[PDB]
Amino acid sequence: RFPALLAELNDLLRGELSRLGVDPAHSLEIVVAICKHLGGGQVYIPRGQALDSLIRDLRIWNDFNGRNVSELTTRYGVTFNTVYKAIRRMRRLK
Partner DNA sequence: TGCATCCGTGAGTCGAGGGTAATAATTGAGGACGTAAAAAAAGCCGGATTAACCGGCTTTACTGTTTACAGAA
Are residues 89 and 57 in contact, defined by beta-carbon separation less than 8 angstroms? yes
**23: helix, coil or strand?**
coil
43 binds DNA (CB under 7 A): yes
69 binds DNA (CB under 7 A): yes
Backbone phi and psi for residue 43, each to the nearest 5 degrees, phi listed first: -160, 135
Please calculate the CA angle 45-46-48 and round it to the nearest 5 degrees: 130
Window contacting DNA (CB under 7 A); options: 18-26, 31-39, 40-48, 54-62: 40-48
Nearest approach in angstroms of CB 81 to DNA is: 3
Nearest approach in angstroms of CB 66 to DNA is: 9
Q: Which residues bind DNA (CB under 7 A)?
A: 41-44, 46, 49, 69-70, 80-81, 84
